[PDB]
């Protein structure tokens, strides 16, 4: 650990000033008023995960009931209902092309669903096994490549046609709750109950960097739109922004009013607005530069598990344990 | 301004809503149980009439009432994250090692862990002390005294009366952790059972109607 202490001095030597000082002289975000333009119903139990499609017109929502449903946002119409072998789920992912959806649960398997088939049903093309514990996040790099996060302290990349791990990321000392994919897809990050977020190169199979600034477990992680920074969500009731090139925490988002844990995070396309979902049943929008809470979006009676901003940037969809998922614009 | 395609989509969408409603209504008839035992528990042993690495399920029906029991082999010792899913369960059965004494302090700490969790407050606990006949044989031999393991148990006032007093003492030890919260929404029910009991499903069944009875009293403003 002597090199780590030298590393601790090395990071301090690299950074001249904190982000907060530089951020001070910019025009304020101002009061933003976002009212829910839609509410989506038909989920009869707690919703753990949602993912926005690339089109921004489709999303998939996983729930305690054991029915994974795909619905259309604007009309609010419902496109599919997928029966699940396991009732217990924590993850859902939407493929970039949109043909594939993945489901992961306490069964320790990530089930990948091809939406298009003869007979017009959703079928599982592959069930992926090799994780000793639950999968906490899944994300598609590509139509044939998926990276999974799990409570084994391991993250795994699979070839769906081959059906076994082509690479294993096993640098973590704790259960890895969340995983975020970069815009370039060649690097990704993952966060865990060890309270450390690590930068993973997809091709190498190695951890390039490790960043820790969190008191508690990180439940959620999101990459900045540029792809050079990311934000994390923790039970510490704090959201911290780290930068890849600088390798240091730029800023932390915290307030006295909120002691409850973060459960989700996402960025607007600007990156000015880091949307966050809390255990207090309220979702707060923060000026990213100044760490000042612009406004609060409070339409949920129970905790918000998942929050996502569309790829086009129009809307924020919040799914909660209240059992219906509300779009916000 | 709504096309035949949008209306025909609305057809299969509303059928999806109806099918989800029917599936949910089918699910609500079932009552869900989560069985946690640290070790030496007899989790398989509790119900033998009826009997996937991550989660292992045993399901039994009594009086045409269906019970779903979930036990996890895959998960590690620490259970913080996966417990959050099972906050809709009817009850959580904690089976504990009656026989050995050295386990009992850690077992009580585990009881406090399951009881005091923020997400699992509303749920109650149904407690079976397995292998109590094996405990009675050892205590009748009298070589090892559980009163030595705890100074309060060293002086205690309540099958032989002494073995019965020790058995009631450990039972009260498990109840002692549960009473402290005092909210009253959640109450633990101690029960005693040897290794081979013809039906502990009867005890699970009467405890379940008691819990549902109390929740209904709370719902109807009777209490």
């Amino acid at each position: 650990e002597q090199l780590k202490n030298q590393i601790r001095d090395a990071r301090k030597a690299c950074a001249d000033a904190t982000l907060s000082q530089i951020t001070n002289n910019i025009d304020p975000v101002g009061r933003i008023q976002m009212r829910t333009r839609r509410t989506l119903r038909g989920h009869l139990a707690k919703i753990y995960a949602m993912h926005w499609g690339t089109d921004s017109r489709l999303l998939v929502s996983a729930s305690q009931d054991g029915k994974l449903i795909i619905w259309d946002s604007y009309t609010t119409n419902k496109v599919h209902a997928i029966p699940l072998r396991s009732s217990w789920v924590m993850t859902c992912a939407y493929a970039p092309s949109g043909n594939y959806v993945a489901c992961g649960g306490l069964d320790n398997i990530c089930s990948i669903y091809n939406l298009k088939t003869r007979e017009g049903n959703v079928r599982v093309s592959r069930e992926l096994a090799g994780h000793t514990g639950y999968l906490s996040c899944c994300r598609f790099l590509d139509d044939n490549q998926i990276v999974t996060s799990s409570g084994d302290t391991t993250c795994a990349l699979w070839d769906i046609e081959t059906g076994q791990q082509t690479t294993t990321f096993t640098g973590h000392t704790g259960d890895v709750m969340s995983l975020s994919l970069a815009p370039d897809t060649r690097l990704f990050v993952s966060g865990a109950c060890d309270a450390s977020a690590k930068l993973w190169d997809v091709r190498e199979g190695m951890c390039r960097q490790t960043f820790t600034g969190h008191e508690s477990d990180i439940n959620a992680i999101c990459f900045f739109p540029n792809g050079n920074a990311f934000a994390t969500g923790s039970d510490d009731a704090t959201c911290r922004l780290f930068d890849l090139r600088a390798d240091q925490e730029l800023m932390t988002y915290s307030h006295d009013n909120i002691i409850c844990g973060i459960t989700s995070v996402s960025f607007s396309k600007s990156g000015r607005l880091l949307l966050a979902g809390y255990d207090d049943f309220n979702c707060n929008v923060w000026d990213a530069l100044k760490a000042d809470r612009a406004g609060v979006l409070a339409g949920h009676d129970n905790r918000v598990s998942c929050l996502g901003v569309t790829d086009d940037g129009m809307a924020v969809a919040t799914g909660s344990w209240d059992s219906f998922l509300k779009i916000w614009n | 301004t709504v096309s035949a395609e949008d209306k025909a989509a609305a057809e299969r969408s509303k059928m999806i809503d109806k099918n989800l409603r029917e599936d949910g209504e089918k699910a609500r008839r079932t009552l869900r149980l989560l069985l946690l035992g640290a070790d030496n528990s007899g989790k398989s042993t509790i119900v033998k009439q009826m009997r996937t690495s991550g989660i292992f399920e045993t399901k039994f029906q009594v009086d045409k009432v269906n019970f779903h029991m979930f036990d996890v082999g895959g998960q590690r010792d620490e259970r913080r994250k996966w417990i959050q899913c099972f906050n809709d369960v009817t009850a959580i059965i904690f089976v504990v090692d009656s026989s050995d004494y050295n386990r009992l302090q850690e077992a009580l700490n585990d009881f406090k862990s399951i009881w005091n969790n923020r997400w699992l407050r509303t749920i109650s606990v149904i407690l079976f002390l397995n292998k109590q006949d094996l405990l009675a044989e050892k205590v009748l031999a009298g070589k090892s005294k559980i009163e030595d393991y705890f100074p309060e148990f060293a002086r205690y006032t309540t099958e032989d009366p002494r073995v019965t007093r020790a058995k009631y003492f450990i039972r009260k030890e498990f109840v002692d952790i549960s009473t402290a919260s005092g909210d009253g929404r959640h109450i633990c029910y101690p029960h005693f059972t040897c290794a081979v009991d013809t039906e502990n499903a009867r005890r699970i069944f009467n405890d379940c109607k008691d819990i549902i009875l109390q929740m209904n009293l709370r719902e109807y403003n009777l209490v």
């Epitope: 939406l115 007979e119 017009g120 | 209306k7 057809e11 299969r12």
Partner: single-chain antibody
Amino acid sequence: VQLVESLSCSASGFAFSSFGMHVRQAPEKGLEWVAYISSGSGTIYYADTVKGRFTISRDDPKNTLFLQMTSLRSEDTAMYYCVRSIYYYGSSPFDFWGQGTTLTVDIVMTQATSSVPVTPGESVSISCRSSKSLLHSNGNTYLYWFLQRPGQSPQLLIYRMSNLASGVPDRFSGSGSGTAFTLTISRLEAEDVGVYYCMQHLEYPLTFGAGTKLEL
């Protein structure tokens, strides 16, 4: 996924209750509409000509689309094949057709040239205008095309003039302006030959055209 007929139309190779089901080919001319039933008997629609003298029935164990006939007339006689669909965002309607049988006893869509001479390797266009503006308040254009090879029931090729059905060679393509539309074919080959029919699905009846033909 095979549809057999005896009208009775027995379906083997898919989940029967998940699909909608629906066509009459005149011996003299092209396709013209009969009737539509949704999945699990949601709704029924008819054109006035064949209306009131036919019935649709579904039975899940028998897995069959049914036609019971009244008022039999020289219009009734026809060759019909069972047609089906699935509707959601990402719709691929009119995907697969039945084998066919023979029995012996609103918007107008047509394309100008009934017969088109074909030269290999040269791009050509088949245009059929629509009476009612295909473009809809969402922005989804409901213009469709088919190909019936002789002796084989037709298949889907292009829907909406911006989307192309899978299972189709990519050479066929589309371009469109509001309520006036022009199709693009390229690199025509053997098995391209046949009669192409186009359709409009803003509101029933299913206005099917007599179509145009590729002639070698």
